[PDB]
Write a protein that binds this ligand. Structure first.
Ligand SMILES: NC1=NC(c2ccccc2)(c2ccccc2)C2=NCCCN12
Length: 369
């Protein structure tokens, strides 16, 4: 029953969402980042200044060495093996999964984030060292009767970094988690969770760009990324429009670059001054699309004071947490699609709300690749 998976996610704002997992026998408890933007189950397996716990292979009677290392610059490196893996607040099963035991790493773990490893939920194509190393979710599906699907409701927050909650529903869709209709955009290719954006508007205003720019060189849905990340040309056009809409109030360019924080005090934030942002995603039907509309409450993340959670990308559009936090997101791997619905937990004022709305007719040459 999915009820037992509700609120199975925790995290610190900006530091990602983690689910509790156990590895080995006896079960070693670890907090593990839910990451739809990578494909390795990788866990701290040696002391680290940011690690208070780590996977200890020698303590596990069920550990099996694959005698094969992994070096992953991008860094973390480790030793491959398999072990029994469970998710206490997830499906009631245990799986023998590939585990990359991280023995050394640079700027990989985050200080104070409270997770000790990463659960790469994307596809084998991008797994390290190569695509032969079966990803956790593939193993889970193959070894159990768990349906080939999962969904994420990331809720966010709403002196110490704010705590965020959410739910990872594995093997299905929990209707209590969203309102209205689920709209689906095709997964263009099975590596990252790649999608196509066909239009974007700021406060109703079309950016009027060739839609190839929205997906240059790709667009992906990535829970392991905090920000909405946009290709250069789109970022600039987006910031311009956002600057204009919130003109009545000047902010340092350091804020727009997402380096500096801006502050008011105790519910004086002029949300209404900032525009909503609509991303139109390719629909399941050729020239049919749908939009997800996010509020400033999503793209200004709390740090009184917030940081601009829209930033520039050189590797394509990244729809990260702040985009997902508005919605219930369905990673329908079995049907190669990703659904979006308004989340039961999304943050909104008494004038606007995050929305998922369709259809809108558009007219398929938007992918780059
Ligand atoms: N999706 C995602 N996951 C990681 C990551 C997230 C958090 C901590 C450490 C690494 C990641 C994880 C494994 C391998 C490479 C990057 C990442 N790095 C920047 C782009 C977004 N991205």
């Amino acid at each position: 029953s999915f009820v037992e998976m509700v609120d199975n996610l925790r995290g610190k704002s900006g530091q990602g969402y983690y689910v509790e997992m156990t590895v080995g026998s006896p079960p070693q408890t670890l907090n593990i980042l839910v990451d739809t933007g990578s494909s390795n189950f990788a866990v701290g397996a040696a002391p680290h200044p940011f690690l208070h716990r780590y996977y200890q292979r020698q303590l596990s009677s069920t550990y099996r060495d694959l005698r094969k290392g992994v070096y992953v610059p991008y860094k973390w490196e480790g030793e491959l093996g398999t072990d029994l893996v469970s998710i206490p607040h997830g499906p009631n099963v245990t799986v023998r999964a590939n585990i990359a035991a991280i023995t050394e790493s640079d700027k990989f773990f985050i200080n104070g984030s409270n997770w000790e490893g990463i659960l790469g939920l994307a596809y084998a194509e991008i797994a390290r060292p190569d695509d032969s190393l079966e990803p956790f979710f593939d193993s889970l599906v193959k070894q159990t009767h768990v349906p080939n699907l999962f969904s994420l409701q990331l809720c966010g927050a709403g002196e110490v970094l704010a705590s965020v909650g959410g739910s990872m529903i594995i093997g299905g869709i929990d209707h209590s988690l969203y309102t209205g209709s689920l709209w689906y955009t095709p997964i263009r290719r099975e590596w990252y969770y790649e999608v196509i954006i066909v239009r974007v508007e700021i406060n109703g205003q079309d950016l009027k760009m060739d839609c190839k720019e929205y997906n240059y060189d790709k667009s992906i849905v990535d829970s392991g990324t905090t920000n909405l990340r946009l290709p250069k040309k789109v970022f600039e056009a987006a910031v311009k429009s956002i600057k204009a809409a919130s003109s009545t109030e000047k902010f340092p360019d350091g804020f727009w670059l997402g380096e500096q924080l801006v502050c008011w005090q105790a519910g004086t934030t002029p949300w209404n001054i900032f525009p909503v942002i609509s991303l139109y995603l390719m629909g399941e039907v050729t020239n049919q699309s749908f939009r997800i509309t996010i509020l400033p409450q999503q793209y200004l993340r709390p740090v009184d004071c917030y940081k601009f959670a829209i930033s520039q990308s050189s590797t394509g559009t990244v729809m990260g947490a702040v985009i997902m936090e508005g919605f219930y997101v369905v990673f329908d791997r079995a049907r190669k699609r990703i659904g979006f619905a308004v989340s039961a937990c999304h943050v909104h004022d008494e004038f606007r709300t995050a929305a998922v709305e369709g259809p809108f007719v558009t007219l398929e040459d938007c992918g780059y690749n």
